[PDB]
Every structure is written in C-alpha cells, then in structure tokens.
From Swiss-Prot:
Belongs to the three-finger toxin family. Long-chain subfamily. Type II alpha-neurotoxin sub-subfamily. It comes from Naja oxiana (Central Asian cobra). One of its GO terms (molecular function) is toxin activity. Gene3D superfamilies: CD59. The keyword Transmembrane helix does not apply. It is found in: Secreted. This is Alpha-elapitoxin-Nno2a. Signal peptide: none annotated. PROSITE patterns: SNAKE_TOXIN.
Amino acid sequence: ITCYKTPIPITSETCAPGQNLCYTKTWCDAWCGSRGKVIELGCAATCPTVESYQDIKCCSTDDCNPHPKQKRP
C-alpha cells in the first residue's frame, strides 16, 4: 500500500513493515493564522484517533490519503 505525504512534493510511497493504512490529519491553529491550513499525512497499522479541534481520515490507499488542498494560488 502507498500513501501521499504532506510536503509540496506530495508523492505516493509504500509504508513500513506492519503498516497497512494511511491517515490524514486536518487541523488549523498557529500556522492557520490566516489561510495556512495544515494537514499531516502518514501511515499506521490501524486508523488513528484524534480529539476535537483536530480531525483525521483513514484510508487503505494513497488515492484516499492525499492533500485536500492541491497547491496554493
């Protein structure tokens, strides 16, 4: 399985041994001072959990774990 990273060069790469899912961390605070929305992508053996202000989305493929925001205008 592969997933998309967060950085500009959002690319698809295979996970480490034992993993099988990808996670999308959606949040906004310091860096979101205006419109700098941040999102942490990665991999995990199982769908991870979050709190209130923070959100997450688990998928079993990069096509489902990309960046909700392509590139800045």
